[PDB]
Each structure stands twice: as structure tokens, then as C-alpha cells.
Design an enzyme around this catalytic site. Structure first.
Site, PDB file in Angstrom:
ATOM      1  N   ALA B  11       4.247  15.814   5.652  1.00  0.00           N
ATOM      2  CA  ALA B  11       5.270  16.703   5.851  1.00  0.00           C
ATOM      3  C   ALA B  11       5.612  17.189   4.667  1.00  0.00           C
ATOM      4  O   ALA B  11       6.084  16.371   3.867  1.00  0.00           O
ATOM      5  CB  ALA B  11       6.370  16.508   6.914  1.00  0.00           C
ATOM      6  N   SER B  79       1.185   9.988   6.429  1.00  0.00           N
ATOM      7  CA  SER B  79       2.361  10.174   7.130  1.00  0.00           C
ATOM      8  C   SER B  79       2.201  10.881   8.596  1.00  0.00           C
ATOM      9  O   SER B  79       1.500  10.770   9.306  1.00  0.00           O
ATOM     10  CB  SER B  79       3.674  10.703   6.427  1.00  0.00           C
ATOM     11  OG  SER B  79       3.112  11.769   5.659  1.00  0.00           O
ATOM     12  N   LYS B 157      14.297   8.114  -0.532  1.00  0.00           N
ATOM     13  CA  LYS B 157      13.367   7.631   0.677  1.00  0.00           C
ATOM     14  C   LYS B 157      11.961   7.530   0.578  1.00  0.00           C
ATOM     15  O   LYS B 157      11.337   6.860   1.056  1.00  0.00           O
ATOM     16  CB  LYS B 157      13.801   8.599   1.813  1.00  0.00           C
ATOM     17  CG  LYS B 157      14.485   8.116   2.823  1.00  0.00           C
ATOM     18  CD  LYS B 157      15.844   6.905   2.386  1.00  0.00           C
ATOM     19  CE  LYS B 157      16.641   6.663   3.511  1.00  0.00           C
ATOM     20  NZ  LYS B 157      17.714   5.580   3.082  1.00  0.00           N
ATOM     21  N   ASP B 208       7.530   1.374   1.549  1.00  0.00           N
ATOM     22  CA  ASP B 208       8.208   2.474   2.076  1.00  0.00           C
ATOM     23  C   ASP B 208       9.395   2.446   2.619  1.00  0.00           C
ATOM     24  O   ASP B 208       9.837   1.675   3.554  1.00  0.00           O
ATOM     25  CB  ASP B 208       6.829   2.801   3.288  1.00  0.00           C
ATOM     26  CG  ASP B 208       7.138   4.374   3.404  1.00  0.00           C
ATOM     27  OD1 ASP B 208       8.153   4.763   3.611  1.00  0.00           O
ATOM     28  OD2 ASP B 208       6.267   4.899   4.050  1.00  0.00           O
ATOM     29  N   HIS B 236       6.578   4.944  -0.328  1.00  0.00           N
ATOM     30  CA  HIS B 236       5.890   6.038   0.866  1.00  0.00           C
ATOM     31  C   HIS B 236       4.649   6.580   0.184  1.00  0.00           C
ATOM     32  O   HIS B 236       3.895   7.040   1.213  1.00  0.00           O
ATOM     33  CB  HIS B 236       6.825   6.988   1.410  1.00  0.00           C
ATOM     34  CG  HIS B 236       6.351   7.954   2.560  1.00  0.00           C
ATOM     35  ND1 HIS B 236       6.355   7.318   3.653  1.00  0.00           N
ATOM     36  CD2 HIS B 236       6.274   9.247   2.390  1.00  0.00           C
ATOM     37  CE1 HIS B 236       5.716   8.559   4.529  1.00  0.00           C
ATOM     38  NE2 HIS B 236       5.966   9.609   3.622  1.00  0.00           N
ATOM     39  N   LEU B 251     -12.346   2.628  -0.875  1.00  0.00           N
ATOM     40  CA  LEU B 251     -13.996   2.280  -0.998  1.00  0.00           C
ATOM     41  C   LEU B 251     -14.312   1.300  -0.269  1.00  0.00           C
ATOM     42  O   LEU B 251     -15.689   1.359   0.245  1.00  0.00           O
ATOM     43  CB  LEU B 251     -13.813   1.765  -2.530  1.00  0.00           C
ATOM     44  CG  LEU B 251     -13.676   3.013  -3.764  1.00  0.00           C
ATOM     45  CD1 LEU B 251     -13.995   2.175  -5.183  1.00  0.00           C
ATOM     46  CD2 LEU B 251     -14.646   4.331  -3.550  1.00  0.00           C
ATOM     47  N   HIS B 255     -17.309   1.336   2.602  1.00  0.00           N
ATOM     48  CA  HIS B 255     -18.394   0.407   2.512  1.00  0.00           C
ATOM     49  C   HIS B 255     -18.618  -0.094   4.017  1.00  0.00           C
ATOM     50  O   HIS B 255     -19.780  -0.162   4.453  1.00  0.00           O
ATOM     51  CB  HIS B 255     -18.229  -0.623   1.623  1.00  0.00           C
ATOM     52  CG  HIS B 255     -19.201  -1.449   1.304  1.00  0.00           C
ATOM     53  ND1 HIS B 255     -18.987  -3.017   0.957  1.00  0.00           N
ATOM     54  CD2 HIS B 255     -20.637  -1.518   1.607  1.00  0.00           C
ATOM     55  CE1 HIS B 255     -20.216  -3.584   0.713  1.00  0.00           C
ATOM     56  NE2 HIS B 255     -21.102  -2.801   1.190  1.00  0.00           N
TER      57      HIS B 255
HETATM   58  O1  LIG Z   1       5.526  13.440   6.556  1.00  0.00           O
HETATM   59  C1  LIG Z   1       6.292  12.446   6.103  1.00  0.00           C
HETATM   60  O2  LIG Z   1       6.081  12.095   4.635  1.00  0.00           O
HETATM   61  C2  LIG Z   1       7.627  12.067   6.921  1.00  0.00           C
HETATM   62  C3  LIG Z   1       8.377  11.017   5.952  1.00  0.00           C
HETATM   63  C4  LIG Z   1       9.656  10.563   6.675  1.00  0.00           C
HETATM   64  C5  LIG Z   1       9.601  10.982   8.139  1.00  0.00           C
HETATM   65  C6  LIG Z   1       8.822  11.904   8.601  1.00  0.00           C
HETATM   66  C7  LIG Z   1       8.050  12.374   7.973  1.00  0.00           C
HETATM   67  O3  LIG Z   1       7.019  13.458   8.681  1.00  0.00           O
HETATM   68  O1  LIG Z   2      18.812   4.860   0.590  1.00  0.00           O
HETATM   69  C1  LIG Z   2      19.714   5.829   0.547  1.00  0.00           C
HETATM   70  O2  LIG Z   2      19.931   6.776   1.243  1.00  0.00           O
HETATM   71  C2  LIG Z   2      20.363   6.252  -0.909  1.00  0.00           C
HETATM   72  C3  LIG Z   2      21.052   7.329  -0.865  1.00  0.00           C
HETATM   73  C4  LIG Z   2      21.683   7.669  -2.233  1.00  0.00           C
HETATM   74  C5  LIG Z   2      21.473   6.913  -3.178  1.00  0.00           C
HETATM   75  C6  LIG Z   2      20.700   5.600  -3.386  1.00  0.00           C
HETATM   76  C7  LIG Z   2      20.052   5.393  -2.165  1.00  0.00           C
HETATM   77  O3  LIG Z   2      19.060   4.280  -2.062  1.00  0.00           O
END
Ligand SMILES: O=C(O)c1ccccc1O
Ligand SMILES: O=C(O)c1ccccc1O
Ligand SMILES: O=C(O)c1ccccc1O
Lengths: 262, 258
Positions: B11, B79, B157, B208, B236, B251, B255
Site C-alpha cells: 500500500a 505486504s 514503522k 518489521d 518492513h 533465486l 530453483h
Molecule cells: O502495505 C503496507 O506496507 C502496509 C503496512 C502496514 C499496515 C498496512 C499495510 O497495508
Molecule cells: O514506534 C514509534 O511509533 C515511534 C514514534 C516516534 C519516534 C520513534 C518511534 O519508534
């Protein structure tokens, strides 16, 4: 002491092009806006929707107009971006500390605004375009041409000294652009009193194959500049192959201004 | 002889997100197609035009339908891309060597298609989304919520182990997306007959923070996989912080399975 850098990408590219430079300037304590021009990057507008340089530069104009009374900026235009810069300099000269042309087409306030692009064509063989696509989308009375770089032109004329990652990134993001010759060939958007009042700095990329160093130097010698900088060993995409050297030059430019003023 | 890798982004991302992995796969003599899904990357479509998961996955569906009679491919869904893979596996299962779920949301053919997304949301407290922007764009009788990752959510995140350059690239290219909850929570678009016939490989990204390893493991434990693999140390965005390792893993998948 900090400065606000407005980075303007070239043809077929977008704000994403500066992703390597943006972090560097910000770490130096500066503000950076890596704008997406019309029909560039993720802007949802279409190229067939643009007929003039102004339509393409609108995002830049809007940013300039939006600037506060006590807010000034340093413009940096890459390649075609220099044409976009001209428009902003003509309308908002008092809000621009200086205009930096990176391996760009730098207009002048003497000939028609298409002058610089005209000279380029007359000094560049049709073989250099390689697989670049030039499709019409205008009319017989009002003709319009789009320009879309192909994988060969990009790899051998613009990214020759860059990495395969850089090449893959560009290949998934490049979009059709235009030189807007019809519009620029019959107009003079740049005057000495406004456009020509903004300090001009040109950054030569020595190993450029899209816009050869020889032509970059011709512009400097022709339209003239306030200062000419050089990044040895950089191809057309200096912000991708030499971001640190580019950063250092931009920091020094912002600093030299502070010495004569601040 | 080389294989055809179809990379499907998550996303708010696009085909550009695979720019570090694509070259590596190709260097190994493989074909790679990192497409943009609807309203993603440079696709000129708008999110407000997407009412269902299908419309979003259309680009992938179009690619499958265009495949030759004897043309096979390897799907890789990051994701949310895991959900787009589901639709392709359900419609063109014969044209898939194996579906690879990279720290993805991997659907099943047992419960409703929104099963995995609902579990994730219940477990994800509102604060964890940080500056992510959720906005509606539908009708009262047919509601639709949009999802646009903000800079803080991306930095802490999804890219906490990636470079500042990667972060700046993302902030410059991300676009609003959607989880398509309504659409997904109303039918069982996936069947064990078609969807379930495709071999599943899940690649766990241990660091992640967007989709925690705990949840990635729960998906493996609750839906089942042909093979579970992990990339230790990857956040992530494995294709950005650990491209070489991701490549090596892909890879072996090419295989092992045919
Ligand atoms: O598509 C993503 O990378 C994603 C990441 C965190 C939460 C929801 C999500 O769809
Ligand atoms: O994990 C979080 O939401 C976060 C938010 C602000 C700064 C550092 C962080 O790890
Ligand atoms: O904008 C560019 O990068 C460019 C490069 C080569 C030739 C013409 C151009 O406008």
C-alpha cells in the site's frame, strides 16, 4: 543562516530525482522542497494537458506565489528545469536569493525564450536522441510535441556513470515531457530588468552526454553567469552519481551569499 | 530458461519500490516486471476510482490475462500486495510456479477474504498508525476509507532500518491507498480449489515494525504455507534494506519449485 532550497527536476523526471540530495541538504540545517512539476512524478495531470511552459511550471509558480513576504529561496534547476526557473525569476525576482542551473538549459533576456533550446538542437545531431520518443498531440494550426526518453538514451546518454539501481528507478518513474518549442519560439518571457536581476550560478557536469559539457560552457560564455561551478566526473544525473559533491557546492553557494549580505 | 518475476508492491507504494532488487534478479538472467497497481506509482488513476480490490489489482489481472498459453510466472507480493496475489492465484492458478508473500497479508480459502486484515486491525491500536491519514471517499450506503502513510509512520514503522535516502524517496512517491475492508468483508473470493492449489512461500522480515513478526508468524501458523523463510535483520522494506538477501532467497524459490 539556514536556507530554503527549491529543487526543480528536468524532463521526464520528478521531485523523486533529488532523493539522494534532499537528506544531505537537510542534515546541513536547510529546508528543501523537491517539487513535482505538472504531469511529472506522481502529479495526476497528463502531458497532453500541457500546452505551454507556464502550464508545466505552474507547481513552481504556485509555490513562489505562496511564499511569505519575509520568505526567500534558492532555486536549483536541473536541465529543462532551468527553463522553469526562468519563469519564476521573471515573476518573483525579489524572492530569489539566486538561481542555480545544474547542467541545464539556461535562458537569456535578449533573444526569444526558445533561443537556448534552439541552439542546442542546431548543435546536437539527431543520432544522439537514440530511442527517445517524439509524438505529436497538438493540432495543425497549434502543433504540440511530447518527448519521452527511452531506455537507451537514459542508460547511455543520461545515466552512463550511474548505477543499475538508478537506472531501474528511472525506468519505473520516467514520464513523457515536452520542450514547448511552439510556445517559447514566439515569445520573450525573460527581461533584463526582472529575470536578469537574479544572480545566476551554473554547475557544469563534465561527463554529461545528454547535454555535453561543451554546450554547457557555451551557455555560460553566451548568456553569461555570475559564477560557474564544476562537478568533475559527473554525468547528466549529478544528484544521483555525485550527491555529496553536489551538496557541497550548494552549501557553498548558500554560504557565499551570507558573506556578501548576512 | 530464466524465470519471470512479477513483483507486486504494497500500500502507498509502486513498482519503483523494487528498484534495488530488480537489477539483481535480472543479473541472474531472470525477467522482472515491477508493475504499478491502479492509482499507484505513476498510474494516472485516482484512489477515489477504486471501489473494490479487483479495480486496484486490475493491472496485475491484465498482466496475467495477457500471459501466453504456456507462459508461467512467479508472483511476489509485499505486504498488502499479498491480497492482490490472492486474486491472481484464484483466476490464473495454472500460470503460477509459486506465490511469494514478503512480510505480506496472506489470505486463506477458509474464512472471509478480509479475515487477515481484520485480525491485524484488532491487534493494531490506533496510535501505532502514527500520522497515517484515513479519509472516506464513498457513499453512506457504500462507505470507502482511504489510507495514506505519513512521514512519521514511514520512518519509524516501515523504514526504521533503511537509509535517509530511501525515506526521502518514499516521502516523495507515496500515494493514498486503501485496505478495501468493505469489499473484502462480504465474500470468500478465494477457494482451496484454485487459490489453494498454488504453492505458498512466506518470507518473514524479523525487524518489521509495520506488520510485526509476531503477526507474520501467526499467519503462517493459522493458514499454512508450503515453505516459511525469513530474512533476519530486515525491516518492513526488505527490498530496500536487504536486497541481496531477498534476491538470494527468491533465486532458491525459483530453483526449488520447478
Ligand atoms: O502495505 C503496507 O506496507 C502496509 C503496512 C502496514 C499496515 C498496512 C499495510 O497495508
Ligand atoms: O514506534 C514509534 O511509533 C515511534 C514514534 C516516534 C519516534 C520513534 C518511534 O519508534
Ligand atoms: O531535461 C533533460 O534532462 C534533457 C536531457 C537531454 C536533452 C534534453 C533535455 O530536456
Amino acid at each position: 543562516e539556514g536556507k530554503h532550497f527549491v529543487l526543480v527536476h528536468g524532463a521526464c523526471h520528478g521531485g523523486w530525482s533529488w532523493y539522494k540530495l534532499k537528506p544531505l541538504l537537510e542534515a546541513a540545517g536547510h529546508k528543501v522542497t523537491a517539487l513535482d512539476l505538472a504531469a511529472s512524478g506522481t502529479d495526476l495531470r497528463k502531458i497532453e494537458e500541457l500546452r505551454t511552459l507556464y502550464d508545466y511550471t505552474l507547481p513552481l509558480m504556485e509555490l513562489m506565489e505562496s511564499l511569505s513576504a519575509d520568505e526567500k529561496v534558492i532555486l536549483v534547476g536541473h536541465s529543462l528545469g532551468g527553463m522553469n526557473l526562468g519563469l519564476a525569476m521573471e515573476k518573483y525576482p525579489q524572492k530569489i536569493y539566486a538561481a542555480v542551473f545544474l547542467a541545464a538549459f539556461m535562458p537569456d533576456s535578449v533573444h526569444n525564450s526558445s533561443f537556448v533550446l534552439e541552439q542546442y538542437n542546431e548543435r546536437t545531431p539527431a543520432e544522439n536522441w537514440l530511442d527517445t520518443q517524439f509524438l505529436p498531440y497538438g493540432s495543425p494550426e497549434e502543433p504540440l510535441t511530447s518527448m519521452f526518453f527511452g531506455p537507451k538514451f537514459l542508460a547511455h546518454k543520461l545515466y552512463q556513470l550511474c548505477s543499475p539501481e538508478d537506472l531501474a528507478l528511472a525506468s519505473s518513474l520516467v514520464r513523457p515531457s515536452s520542450l514547448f518549442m511552439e510556445d517559447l519560439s514566439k515569445a520573450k518571457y525573460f527581461t533584463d530588468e526582472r529575470f536578469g536581476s537574479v544572480k545566476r550560478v551554473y554547475i557544469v557536469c563534465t561527463e554529461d552526454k545528454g547535454i555535453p559539457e561543451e554546450f554547457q560552457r557555451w551557455q555560460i560564455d553566451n548568456i553569461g553567469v555570475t559564477e560557474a561551478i564544476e562537478i568533475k566526473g559527473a554525468d547528466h544525473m549529478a544528484m544521483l552519481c555525485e550527491p555529496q559533491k553536489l551538496c557541497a557546492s550548494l552549501l557553498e553557494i548558500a554560504h557565499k551569499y551570507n558573506l556578501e549580505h548576512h
